[PDB]
Design an enzyme around this catalytic site. Structure first.
Site, PDB file in Angstrom:
ATOM      1  CB  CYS B 148      -1.087   0.021   1.086  1.00  0.00           C
ATOM      2  SG  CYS B 148      -0.530   0.317   2.773  1.00  0.00           S
ATOM      3  NE  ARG B 183      19.472   1.754  -1.833  1.00  0.00           N
ATOM      4  CZ  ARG B 183      20.437   2.620  -2.138  1.00  0.00           C
ATOM      5  NH1 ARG B 183      20.198   3.640  -2.956  1.00  0.00           N
ATOM      6  NH2 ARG B 183      21.656   2.445  -1.650  1.00  0.00           N
ATOM      7  CB  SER B 184      12.899   1.363   4.036  1.00  0.00           C
ATOM      8  OG  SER B 184      11.672   1.697   3.401  1.00  0.00           O
ATOM      9  CG  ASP B 206      21.249   3.526   1.620  1.00  0.00           C
ATOM     10  OD1 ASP B 206      22.232   3.590   2.385  1.00  0.00           O
ATOM     11  OD2 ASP B 206      20.357   2.668   1.737  1.00  0.00           O
ATOM     12  CB  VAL B 207      22.093   6.406   5.490  1.00  0.00           C
ATOM     13  CG1 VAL B 207      20.650   6.648   5.905  1.00  0.00           C
ATOM     14  CG2 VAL B 207      22.422   4.924   5.569  1.00  0.00           C
ATOM     15  CG  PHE B 272       7.079   7.820   2.044  1.00  0.00           C
ATOM     16  CD1 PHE B 272       7.877   8.286   1.005  1.00  0.00           C
ATOM     17  CD2 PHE B 272       7.567   6.807   2.858  1.00  0.00           C
ATOM     18  CE1 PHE B 272       9.138   7.749   0.780  1.00  0.00           C
ATOM     19  CE2 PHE B 272       8.824   6.264   2.641  1.00  0.00           C
ATOM     20  CZ  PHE B 272       9.611   6.735   1.601  1.00  0.00           C
ATOM     21  CB  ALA B 273       8.789  10.304   6.802  1.00  0.00           C
ATOM     22  CB  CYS B 274       4.929   9.039  10.639  1.00  0.00           C
ATOM     23  SG  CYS B 274       4.079   7.582   9.961  1.00  0.00           S
TER      24      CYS B 274
END
Lengths: 317, 317
Positions: B148, B183-184, B206-207, B272-274
């Site tokens: 989702c 990049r999770s 990415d980190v 999209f992060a909370c």
């Protein structure tokens, strides 16, 4: 009184006779053609290469056909896995980590064909471990193999006579206490739980906190009960370690040193990291000491593969 | 010329009509009794609680029965999941992360019943995404739902008309360029790849390093080709960002700020992060800006659930 040193090899040698015979019978039914185990190398690490060689040779010595596929760039490793999944010639697949060295590896371990996964990398083998499920089928004929690394460590324990064979299965480790310095989803947490369900109280160590795994306290699920404990404080790690006469260690740091002050007299010490985390002098305190599991690990995925084969033909029709 | 702001809600409202009707027909065949979606809360985070409430209410408003099971200690969450797996009354399950906030969560996302996993948490949905597989069956009747969160982001893109609907499917994003700051394995990598396979060149961040996802360069596997690029250097992040007129961001830091200097005129910005990672003033540079996906995400797992139900009855006999 100096602690004895047991080599992983000496432990693996124990399983030799058993493994050979199975491979032999398989040759019979498959015209002298033994099981083919494809290995996947995809990391620029010499340590893994040596291990790849060990596995490579040991299996062939047992009568196994080892195809060692070396990938250049990591991104195509995946592709190689699927083509291998559908190749019937391939009987077993195994991957050498760290490939990407992160979540991707956990993803990769789930790509491998479930019925060919020789190391029990697939999630199901983990879930079956935690929920103490023995078989994958309903007729109770397809044994669920357990991830080789944690399994190996346990088999080392059985060899070392630490397992009190005068007690029934699932409770042989009753009155003992162990501490695991690592809680990886790969082998840290699984091992700790695997030990707890055999009896022994387990002090699980993590970079951030400590915990205490014990027998399951539930009727809704047959899973080790996880007791929690204070945030990770160096001195905390101590008290736990002191009490537990069995200390397993597997932290990936090439410069991690486990204070010898911690272990207790007669304490069995085992390390599974591809590096030494025990401070050399450790022998004068511990009873028995196993510097590395590698060889044993290999033997486990080997007999595991035989198990998977038996299942495949047992479920062939 | 100030950039317009689009609320996640406005985007989710679009799907309302569609979702209702399906739920309605389902009620018919199940005597006014709609689908039951159990939610799993197990974290001491107010942010997740609010989101849990949003989901909780929104679904009920659609005609869904939402059972919100709140667990005290994390270790028993698992147990709750299995009992829910076998409960036929339960039609859909969803978990609120971070529960353990580490590998365990990736493990938990694999425990959920594959045919009830409403968010596409299960590994298969991920693999099917990467290998561009549409259905789970062979008769091509059981569509494979996509996770989702990444799906939602794409649907936001379709709403924003950034998707050039004059091009055939799978190549609508042809001449565009996107950059993903995260990049999770959960939604970072999946999203980036999902976009790449539609056409657009993707600058994955990415980190540690940067990368460039593009269309698949292989006949052996229909998977986005991963081009690599230099180690993560702040200035590197810049050049990439500048070129790409579509920037998605989802880094979990409550204090991460994306230098407005990076985005380009007319660049679409989505997070999209909370938490907010876009530096507020961002509106004067970007064309359209979506502060959060939450609402949309909810709508996705909702229609997803309807999809799973259809599959379950479609595979009922």
């Amino acid at each position: 009184k100096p602690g004895r040193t047991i080599l992983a090899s000496k432990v693996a040698e124990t399983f030799n006779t058993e493994i050979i015979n199975n491979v032999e019978e398989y040759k019979k039914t498959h015209n002298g053609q033994g099981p083919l185990l494809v290995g996947f190398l995809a990391n620029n690490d010499p340590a893994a290469k040596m291990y790849a060689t060990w596995t490579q040779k040991t299996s062939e010595s047992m009568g196994f056909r080892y195809d060692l596929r070396v990938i250049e760039d990591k991104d195509f490793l995946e592709e190689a896995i699927i083509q291998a999944n559908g190749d019937d010639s391939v009987n077993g697949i195994m991957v050498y980590f760290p490939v990407f060295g992160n979540a991707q590896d956990q993803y990769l371990q789930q790509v491998v064909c479930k019925e060919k996964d020789v190391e029990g990398l697939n999630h199901v083998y983990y879930q079956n471990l935690y929920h103490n499920v023995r078989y994958l089928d309903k007729e109770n004929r397809l044994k669920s193999i357990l991830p080789c690394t944690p399994l190996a460590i346990v088999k080392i324990l059985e060899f070392l006579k630490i397992y009190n064979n005068l007690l029934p299965e699932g409770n042989r480790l009753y009155g003992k206490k162990c501490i695991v310095i690592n809680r990886s989803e790969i082998v840290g947490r699984p091992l700790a739980a695997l030990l707890a369900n055999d009896g022994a109280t387990v002090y699980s160590v993590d970079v951030n906190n400590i915990q205490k795994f014990t027998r399951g306290e539930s009727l809704k699920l047959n899973k080790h009960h996880v007791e929690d404990l204070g945030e990770y404080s160096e001195d905390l790690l101590k008290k736990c370690s002191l009490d537990s006469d069995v200390v397993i260690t597997g932290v990936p740091s090439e410069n991690y040193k486990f204070p010898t002050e911690y272990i207790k007299e007669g304490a069995v010490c085992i390390n599974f990291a591809c590096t030494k985390n025990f401070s050399d002098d450790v022998k004068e305190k511990a009873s028995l000491y196993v510097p590395m599991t590698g060889k044993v690990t290999i033997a486990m995925l080997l007999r595991n593969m035989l198990r998977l084969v038996r299942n495949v033909e047992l479920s062939k029709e």
